[PDB]
DNA sequence: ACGTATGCTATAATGTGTGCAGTCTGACGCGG
């Protein structure tokens, strides 16, 4: 979606944003996988479990 | 509409009715519902003219048919609304009224002008007490003041022949009655009496006031106004609001109390009323008329409707909020818009994007223009709506016009020329700007947020001067420092880096490629990596003896990458460039070696395609910033686990009682000092090469690609400072105060802080974030000052025909040479024959230009010292000659006459200044201040050379120094100095003068955080005015009872032993004291405050022994904040609290008479028969011992040296010097460049004025202080008719004082002091014939330098011819 | 010492009589026969008396010094015209004087816009009113609410509200911040920018050339009608002082230069294309 | 020409008596229709004035000789 | 500035004397003010408003 | 924002200011003090004049250029006469002293 | 605000100094599309004439 | 007649004050 700067990092020493990045992308890979399965249309027992 | 000069004279009652059309005579405005002027009122169409083009208020004559009548029912006359703001009115004061101007703004004027005080006027004014007039009778003398009972007593007694009167009449009749004829003789007689200091001062300026008075034209009495003018209505408004409301200036209401008042003056004089209630209203009036021309003054402004004080009239003329500042010198202005900007990374350096909707609205006028040419407009209101529908066709017209049309772009804020640089406009379909990348440093301009102002060239003059002057492509190179300002950044830099940088083997190493044609081939087919060592044959070409082209081909082992970079390499630079890694600062050499070498059309390609393989390699490449890249120390948390009990240790030490506190607070800064350094190296360390692991058959050792290292190695964005506070530790940060907190960062971004160390490293970055807005005022302010004084510089004459010039030796300081010869002497046309070592043949001639070819032969030669034609060396009135000034560094060949130096040495000097409080402001937040200076280690062998050195041996068998300012050479083989250092104060040398040194050996050695007082001889230690509780303090500690002596300063001190100096006194063992070695001065070491001493009274000593120690508590990051105020102090030239004494004539020093300390000194010269004596302090101590061959302007006292003691003495190339370095020296802690002839072109202004010693020809006499270019035109021609030369003596002006001292009042008034300048250029009656930039830019006229210089000269020679 | 105007003064009546019943009736009977010294007294006497009542009459339009001053003008007119043979006290006599010669005075130099007497003393009457209503209605009267109390005209009350409504100075500060007063916005009406200028220079110089193109009687007959070429702008039955003499004929040709002019302005490219200007 | 004015410079010298030397000519062709003496391929007057000075064809002598030689052939014509 | 009392010192009010003049100040919700300052020779002197 | 002629001021006769009365950028003296280093001196004269005060000036050049005619025709800033006026109004005598 | 996937890293200088590079398909989406409701006022006043 | 202005009222009353009081470095000018 949007492409950033990365020398807009080391002298702002703003480190946040890259931890935000990371994980907002593990939450949204969390998301990819339930995405994946509610599509898939499982199993209200195999959801629970992950 | 043409004139030459403007004049100020004060207004005569009768001179200021001849402007007055009209007395108004009535506070009414308008009539309520028919919105009209009244009858005789403030709006009054009798008096102003009428309101609209040619209309009558009734109505009985309408436009031009009745071109110039009179109407007769109304009496309006019909001419345009045009005369509502020319014509203006006045008042008939009942009783005559004083100028605020003329009594308040010091001097007091009126009072000056009488030898009255302001007390004695004003007390008359308010009605306090009377004032003789003149006295008959000699009983009463003029201007004796008479209190109500005083004024009884003479009536019945003497009475008739004394006439005394009260209020502004009398004084008006003392002003009236005055001879300035006379009592200027009178004052003249007395002066040859026995004149002083203040005596002949005060005779002097009243002299020169009264001869100025009577040659002016001016009389006295016009201080007092019997009439009062007023503003035409349109410049005091009152106007309807679109919501039924109305809205009027403050004038209006202001001159509604001045009239009412004074009409109710004439009412009680009708009345004859009782003198008391007569006295309160003219005492009303006068507040009135003083509240009207400058209201905030001598009493409480008066406030109006929203509690806030009325505006006056002197308030609209005053300071920023004024015309000057405001609405003359500062306009809006047309074919100007402004918008957000963003990259332009496709653009050329000669390009930038322009909003179609914004072009078209900017180049209206030429749409009209050129649709009548096509015929598709038959009309312009035809051509309005072909616009406003934006119909297909008009835009392909206005895409027409704008081409080959340059447009300026302006970033705020305008520091340097360089704030504006126009391009050529390329129309884009949105709102937003695009911007060249390369030209974003001059700028500063941070795609963040920014805004750009855009600016139309409307004239084909101002066509050309911006394709010529301010096209980014003719400006490449900085004013201010002969360096390229254009240079790429962060992504371009990086692209390079990547490219350039190489790696082990890769794919495809070691092969062999026909050109790097074949190296694009294998990289983009995917049989290559941009990282491989492959030997390709490149054919460089290389320029000859002559203009030719020489060709070589070779085998060259380089990388991929390097070979295609060699594809935007023009044919003229040799490979040898390319061959290395490139970075931020290599680049920048390529750019300017491409400059010096091939051209201007060369280096603009050559820009644009580094930019474009930068940015396109550099996103080829793909790099990121992770979490796992800030790599930390794998051992911080046993650096600083341990450093911290270092700093624990000495805690326990201080509550003791023997380390003090100011010694351990420089010393747990240099333990947290060397720990921060530990950090950072053992990060860098372990990032740098972190590449351990290679292969090929095992391993190798390799650069980092941690991509955060690659970022900052490169040069591009960041460096070794800021990854400390990411992977390391942030660092210690400053207090918004000043000082630096006792506990730093230890956290980094990475960890993550606790909740305190964020809280901690809030107090540092508020105080950062805090000068970032309000220091900057004082560097913006700075910029400002420097300017206006350094506005009339231009380059006038080619040659000034002058052989003197100003002796620049090699700045060497610090070890290495801060800033070389060759450096410092570059584009300077040198002032004496300066050949090679063997004087036999002439190297280089006079008048030349030192190119860096020529400097290159320097080198060679290695030339010692050299003579450069300097500017304040210039003999050129008015101006300066381009061989004085040299090379314009921003161009980069000899200056063109007719460019405007002074503003552009100004702007160089201001610009780092105020954006060195922003750069690293924002981003900055932790102090890295490194003195660790302990010992000095000389690094080549050579033999020690010490000069203005005087030491003597100590028991230890060392040779100790005791003298302050000891300098440290390092002799070469041949002959010549190498490295310098800077020995201080008591300081342990390891081998005295003229001894040989090895390489890497500690030649001087001592404590650092202490300034030890070491005696001269040995003996026994007196006590002497060291008094208990007066002068010094005692704490003891237990069981033996070892106590310290601290000595109190007159701030700890009491005022019983105030005028006491505490010293410790040498003695022997008899108990006389002991002589230092060759002097009548027996032993005395006065201890200064807050010094620490160990050693109590009855304690043996030898030679070399230190007998107390001074703390030197420095930690304080100077940066730009605390080092800008010693700079203005130098412009502003300040005299410290501590100046060093320098000998006047040459001679035999003879110590001479005392007083309780104080030292007096009978010098009497060699040929100099009459004495000269100087007085000293007590507690400050010499450099010579009496009795001594003292030259010129030898150093007697040690300390801060006063500028103006440097020239006074020294003559011009010395306070030159002073100033040049001493700037210098602050702006080079910063890493400032600055040629050393910007300070120069200051310098030389601040040298304008110069005060007359000796009768001339001319009436100059004694006293008198007039500019230099002029009392030299007179040298000019009494040389040639002889009659009595003027000898003089040049004096030092500060810059605020500087810009106020220049003939030109306008020039003053627009600059400061607005109150004061105007009143003496009244007084004075002076006409200023204009030859300042702002003088001409007020006025809005052809500036009479750079373009217009060659037109404003054509105008001299028609004054000339006849 | 004492260097504030108001202060001085204050002193000086502060040292001036203070007469009794028959001391004012011995200065007042020889004030009116012109006593000169008299008439000097009885006003330097009662200047305490102008301060006093100045003391209530401030904050209202001038300053405390500037209501004196006017106050000490009644107190003049008092001394000009009192009865010393009445038994009635003077002070009684004079206060009448100081309250209205002050509010006068305060009635012209209060507002810039100079407000005869006769439009604001009915407005005081119409605000007095509101106070009535507001404390019963505890609402702010209407224009109407008043205008039913008095029984009085609407638009009478609405008028005399906007008489009412004070002014904002062009030199004023915008919204807590001195940043740029009102004159720094509000723009010039008279004069229209270049656009403006040379709209009405071309137009009118294309019509001169578009005269120049139509017939010598017909550009004679419409230019000096409408005031174009000649002195006075004169209608279709006066334009028979000059030579045509005829109200038919001059109709007729004034048309028929129009009707000729029309198509040179569909020809150049106007016509309806300066018809919505 | 267009990028560059430095080839410019190199002929007069004085960077500003250059701007006041290719006004003068731009506005003898903006004014007077004078010929363009080098091929103008469609650019303003701003540019061709400063190709006439590039390669030498304008110059401060140059324009005042030409100016009194239209001038001087009004005088004998006159009179 | 909360109201009540408040001991302040300037510094070096004259740093020709460089001594720390202490003062005192009354600071009231409503009312006129009450400071207390020293002098150069230490004389105790009190400043309403 | 974008301006080429439009709204002028009550007395100081400049442009307004901003895109909210439709107003030309400020050029002030340190955005001066860039064209008098540069040395262009008609584009300066011009952003005091005919982009300004210049009453005269703004209309007629408007009128030179849809002729086509880029031509410098200056007269004197309005607000400078205003001063004039000003400082006379204040009781003294400052009158233009001719060549 | 709105989350969205982001890579850091240059791209010919389109992030040149913090400068964004923003896909079509954020537009598309009309996820950055803000709603300004404006507020216009039309006043019959009472003039002289 | 209409709008604006000018005038008088007769208990006695007679010295004001209102309102923000952490700028700051640097430079003279009147007394003391
Ligand atoms: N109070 C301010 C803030 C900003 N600016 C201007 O805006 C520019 C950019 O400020 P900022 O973006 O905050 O700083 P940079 O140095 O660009 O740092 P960063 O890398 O964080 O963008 C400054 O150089 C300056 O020209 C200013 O004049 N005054
Ligand atoms: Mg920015
Ligand atoms: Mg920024
Ligand atoms: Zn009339």
Redesign the pocket.
Known sequence: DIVLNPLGVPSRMNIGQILETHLGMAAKGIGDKINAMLKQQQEVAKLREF | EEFDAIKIALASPDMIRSWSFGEVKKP?TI????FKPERDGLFCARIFGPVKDYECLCGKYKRLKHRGVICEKCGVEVTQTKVRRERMGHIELASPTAHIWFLKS???RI??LLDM????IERVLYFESYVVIEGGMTNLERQQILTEEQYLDALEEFGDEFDAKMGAEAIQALLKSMDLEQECEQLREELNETNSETKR?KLT?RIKLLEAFVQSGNKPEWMILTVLPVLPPDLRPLVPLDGGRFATSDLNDLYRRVINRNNRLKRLLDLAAPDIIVRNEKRMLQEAVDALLDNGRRGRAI?GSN?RPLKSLADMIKGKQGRFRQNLLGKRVDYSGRSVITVGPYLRLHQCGLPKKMALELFKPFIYGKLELRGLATTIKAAKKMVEREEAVVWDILDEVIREHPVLLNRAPTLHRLGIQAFEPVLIEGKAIQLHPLVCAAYNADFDGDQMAVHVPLTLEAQLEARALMMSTNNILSPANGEPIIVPSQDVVLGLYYMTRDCVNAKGEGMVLTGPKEAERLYRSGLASLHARVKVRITEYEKDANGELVAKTSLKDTTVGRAILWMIVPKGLPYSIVNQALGKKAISKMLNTCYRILGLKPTVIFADQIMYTGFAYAARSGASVGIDDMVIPEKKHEIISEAEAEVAEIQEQFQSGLVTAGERYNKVIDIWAAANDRVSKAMMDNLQTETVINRDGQEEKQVSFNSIYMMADSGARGSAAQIRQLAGMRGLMAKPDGSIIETPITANFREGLNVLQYFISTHGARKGLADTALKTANSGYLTRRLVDVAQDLVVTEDDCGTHEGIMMTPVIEGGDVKEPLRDRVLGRVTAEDVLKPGTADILVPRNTLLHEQWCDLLEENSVDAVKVRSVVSCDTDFGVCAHCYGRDLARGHIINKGEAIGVIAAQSIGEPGTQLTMRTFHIGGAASRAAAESSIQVKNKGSIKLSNVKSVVNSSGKLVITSRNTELKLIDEFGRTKESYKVPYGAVLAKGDGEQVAGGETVANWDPHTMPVITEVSGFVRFTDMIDGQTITRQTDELTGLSSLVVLDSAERTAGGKDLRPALKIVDAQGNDVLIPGTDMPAQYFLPGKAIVQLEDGVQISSGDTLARIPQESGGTKDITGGL?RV??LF????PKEPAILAEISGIVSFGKETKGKRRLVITPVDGSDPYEEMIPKWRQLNVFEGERVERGDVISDGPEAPHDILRLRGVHAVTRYIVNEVQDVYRLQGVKINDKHIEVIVRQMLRKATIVNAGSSDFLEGEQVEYSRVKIANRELEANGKVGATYSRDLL?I??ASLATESFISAASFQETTRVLTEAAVAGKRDELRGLKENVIVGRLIPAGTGYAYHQDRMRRRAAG | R?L?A??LY????????????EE?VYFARRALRGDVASRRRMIE???????????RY?NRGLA?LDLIEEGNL?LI??V?????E????????????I???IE?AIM?QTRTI?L????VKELNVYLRTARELSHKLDHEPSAEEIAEQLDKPVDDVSRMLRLNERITSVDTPLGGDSEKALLDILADEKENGPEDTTQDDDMKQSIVKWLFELNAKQREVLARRFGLLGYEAATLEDVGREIGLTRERVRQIQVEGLRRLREILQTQGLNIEALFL | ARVTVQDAVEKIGNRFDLVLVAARRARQMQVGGKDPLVPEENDKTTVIALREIEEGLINNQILDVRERQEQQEQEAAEL | ?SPGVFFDSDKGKTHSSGKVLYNA?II?Y????LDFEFDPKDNLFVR?? | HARSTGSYSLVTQQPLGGKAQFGGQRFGEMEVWALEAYGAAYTLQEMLTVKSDDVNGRTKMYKNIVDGNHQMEPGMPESFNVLLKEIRSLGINIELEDE | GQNMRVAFMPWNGYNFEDSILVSERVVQEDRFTTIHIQELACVSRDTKL
Do not use: C, M
């Open positions: 009414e009539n309520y519902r028919t010091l001097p007091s009072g000056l005080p302001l007390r004695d001062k300026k406030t509690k105020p203005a102090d502003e030239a300040r005299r500060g605020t004082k | 004492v504030d108001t202060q204050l002193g000086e009546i502060g040292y001036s009589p203070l007469l009794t019943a004012e006497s009662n200047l305490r008396l102008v301060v006093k009542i100045a003391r401030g405390l009644g007119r008092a000009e015209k009192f009865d010393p009445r038994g009635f006290r003077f002070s009684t006599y004079a206060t009448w004087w309250r209205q010669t006068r012209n100079r005869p007497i006769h439009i | 500035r100040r009231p409503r009312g006129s003010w309403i408003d």
